[PDB]
């Protein structure tokens, strides 16, 4: 379970094995993270020229 | 009289913003 072969968790307190759900994010973190990088280069550059 | 001068003044202010739009209209 810790290696995340299988998408379960243990409820130790209970002494039972309980369900987990495999997909916990969509492709919007990746997508935005790439955009932030581009934008930040372009801006940083532009400010310098303006002066 | 003073009020008549003010009315004219506000028109002068609006125009400059139009001038920068006269330039933008030509690019289109």
């Amino acid at each position: 379970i810790l290696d995340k072969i299988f998408y379960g968790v243990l409820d130790q307190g209970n002494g039972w094995l309980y369900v987990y759900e495999t997909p916990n994010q969509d492709a919007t973190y990746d997508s935005a993270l790439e955009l932030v990088g581009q934008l930040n280069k372009v801006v940083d550059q532009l400010f310098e020229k303006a002066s | 009289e003073q009020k008549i001068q003010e009315t004219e003044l506000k028109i002068r202010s609006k125009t400059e913003n139009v001038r920068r739009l006269e330039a933008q209209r030509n690019a289109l």
Partner: protein
């Protein structure tokens, strides 16, 4: 004769520039003549007009030193002199009517808020501030910044932190002058650290570290640490040591506002994460602060909205939330909405520009 009118005017400006301690010998003795100079054939002409040939700033520089009350010497029931200034500035204020007046008009309001900040009452501020809006496109980058600084100070007594944070952060991003990097810069930093304390979100003074004296910094760190670690004991002894400092700057108001904040900050670090948090822990922390008002303060604490909890004392547990949001409806959409508005205003400027 054309030349005569012009020649008087250039001379009046020139006398105003010189008198910042060159060929001079008492700013106060000379004030009478400066008032004299100002009003005929200058202040008089301009009736529907504003310029940067007329400048309150020159007169501000002059007037400011007299308001250390060392020429008055507190022998008197009220200053005459400030009343005279105020009378005359308010006289301009009439003439302005928000048709072309935003320029010099804005300086007069900075001056008016300053006198309230020295020792007046800051409830009169509200109208001036509102009157004083009208599209601003003729005020200088340093002027914008000083006005914001004064405005922020107003907001803080009125218990409006967020509004003050936005203004002070907007101020320091104006002014490429190397003359407002000097002591004025220090004053500005002081106020941004104070606002950070009040919200109680307070980050470390890292940024401030290469832009202030190491002498300023250490006491400044001392205050922040007092809040952050969340001790009343630590906080009181820091107030006791750096008494002269808090007095001197005149940000003695902190001592009232912050005490209630400090005690709350101190509960907050102690976790509220799970569905019940045992009553004994939270009681323990509070017991140090005051053990006669443990229910009253926790209830008050909840009421404020800083943190939020549920109590049963017929179970003797305090029940809590995670303090972590959801994304499933309008409230993140409201952040989306603010951002697009900000972009559009900015867009309008780039096109105009």
């Amino acid at each position: 004769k054309t030349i005569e009118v012009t020649a008087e005017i250039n001379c009046f400006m020139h006398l105003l520039v010189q008198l910042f301690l060159w060929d001079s010998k008492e700013l106060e003795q000379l004030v009478e003549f400066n008032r004299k100079v100002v009003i005929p054939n200058l202040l008089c002409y301009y009736n529907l007009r504003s310029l940067n040939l007329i400048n309150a700033k020159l007169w501000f520089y002059i007037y400011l030193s007299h308001e250390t009350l060392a020429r008055s010497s507190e022998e008197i029931n009220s200053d005459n002199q400030n009343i005279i200034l105020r009378s005359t500035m308010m006289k301009f204020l009439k003439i302005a009517s928000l048709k072309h007046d935003n320029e010099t008009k804005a300086m007069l309001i900075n001056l008016i808020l300053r006198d309230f900040l020295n020792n007046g009452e800051v409830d009169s501020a509200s109208d001036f501030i509102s009157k004083l809006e009208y599209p601003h496109t003729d005020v200088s980058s340093s002027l914008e910044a000083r006005y914001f600084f004064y405005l922020s100070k107003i907001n803080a007594i009125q218990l409006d932190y967020s509004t003050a944070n936005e203004y002070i952060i907007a101020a320091i991003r104006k002014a490429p002058h190397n003359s407002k990097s000097l002591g004025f810069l220090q004053q500005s930093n002081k106020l941004h650290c104070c606002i950070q304390l009040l919200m109680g979100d307070i980050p470390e003074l890292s940024f401030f570290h290469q832009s202030n004296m190491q002498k300023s910094l250490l006491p400044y760190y001392h205050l922040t640490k007092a809040v952050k670690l969340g001790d009343l004991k630590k906080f009181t002894s820091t107030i006791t040591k750096y008494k002269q400092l808090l007095l001197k700057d005149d940000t003695y108001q902190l001592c009232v506002r912050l005490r209630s904040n400090v005690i709350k900050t101190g509960i907050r670090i102690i976790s509220l994460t799970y569905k019940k948090i045992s009553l004994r822990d939270i009681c323990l922390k509070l017991n140090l602060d005051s053990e006669q008002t443990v229910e009253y303060m926790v209830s008050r604490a909840i009421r404020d909205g800083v943190i939020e909890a549920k109590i049963n004392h017929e179970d003797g547990f305090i029940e809590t939330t995670e303090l972590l949001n959801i994304y499933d409806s309008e409230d993140p959409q409201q952040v989306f909405d603010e951002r697009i508005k900000f972009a559009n205003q900015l867009h309008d400027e780039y096109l105009v520009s």
